[PDB]
Symmetry: none
Subunit: 231 residues, 2 copies
């Protein structure tokens, strides 16, 4: 199948709620090595979000059952083996996405908006790995999330205006990552305050017909600053 | 493995909404060659109904998309090929179930309630097959569906109470088969009305354990009779 056929197959698969098929089609599109259109990039992202989310949901269900069962019944052992099967599937999905990002999408992106999108995607899929990782692997996946988000962050600061919704959204998510995952509330507040203040300083340049694209997110930054400051 | 372990896996899979896994576990249970408990029989039925139902839904969606006017020859060919992909999956699933029924479940059944349950399943999965068939295979799967439903129906009238949920569910599925697959409103209405009337003539045969299931199916039979007579 050529790219036109694969994209149509992905759209059909989406309509039919066959997201493994959708992901396979968009994986093949990506592997042709060209920058993705906005439509193609959205199909890829939606496909893998659904595939990984189904496995994450199953994993959470089995883990909850495991925690509730009596610790010497075979139901504890069956849950363990089944949870491990789901974990390996989740890891394989994440590794496929991470390989697409590292081999094709990130290096070939020629616009900063695309590059930020793909680096945030990389951070997200390392976070999915973190949720099922154990031992020293876990700290590693966390660090890899941090690094990818940090890279997206730096690009957004250098190539986008402070009121750009993409830059604001990244500052929101990254400061939250510092607060919740790295347990670093001082730095989280510093990041959010910096992004909020920098956009405040440029409010007078926005158009009256579209300023809410920015101020909505600015409000969330300030909201978090308030919450975290009270603790 | 142990049956208990495979059933535990099937219940975990069901909770996780992983119905391909659930069906595989219950297929393995069935292939041990022993009569299933009511619990195992219901897990098998639920698993494969979920598995086949997902593909039937997808097939309907793609057939609907295909119905639309499409000027691009390549898109139209992709819709046709994707529908055919789903149809081949459906056929594989139905053939697996029909093989389990023919090789294990129907011949080893020692009580009429199970015999009826499995003959009803055989009717259902030949009906599913018929929906994606063509040519003479179409006629053959439709005839096999009808024959299995009819065998089930004769046994159920002899051996089960008219409010038993399996006898009522058989009447529901068989009458809907007449209406939707055979295109015979007369036969569909006759069957559904007989089953509904026979149930309400014997309310003393209801019981606490199955009351809700019985009355739910009686209401579906009633709804269909009202629609088909309109």
């Amino acid at each position: 199948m050529d790219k036109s056929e694969l994209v149509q197959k992905a759209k059909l698969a989406e309509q039919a709620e066959r997201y493994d098929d959708m992901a396979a089609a968009m994986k093949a599109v990506t592997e042709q090595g060209h920058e993705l259109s906005n439509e193609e990039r959205n199909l890829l992202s939606v496909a893998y979000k659904n595939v990984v989310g189904a496995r994450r949901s199953s994993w959470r269900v089995i883990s909850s059952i495991e925690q509730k069962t009596e610790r010497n019944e075979k139901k504890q052992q069956m849950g363990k083996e089944y949870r491990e099967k789901i974990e390996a599937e989740l890891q394989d999905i994440c590794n496929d996405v991470l390989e697409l990002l590292d081999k094709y999408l990130i290096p070939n992106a020629t616009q900063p908006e695309s590059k930020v999108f793909y680096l945030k995607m990389k951070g997200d899929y390392f976070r999915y790995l973190s949720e099922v990782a154990s031992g020293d692997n876990k700290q590693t996946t966390v660090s890899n999330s941090q690094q990818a988000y940090q890279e997206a962050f730096e690009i957004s600061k250098k190539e986008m205006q402070p009121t750009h919704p993409i830059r604001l959204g990244l500052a929101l998510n990254f400061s939250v990552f510092y607060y919740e995952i790295l347990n670093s509330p001082e730095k989280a507040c510093s990041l959010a305050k910096t992004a909020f203040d920098e956009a405040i300083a440029e409010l007078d340049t926005l158009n009256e017909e579209s300023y809410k694209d920015s101020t909505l997110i600015m409000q969330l930054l300030r909201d978090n600053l308030t919450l975290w400051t009270s603790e």
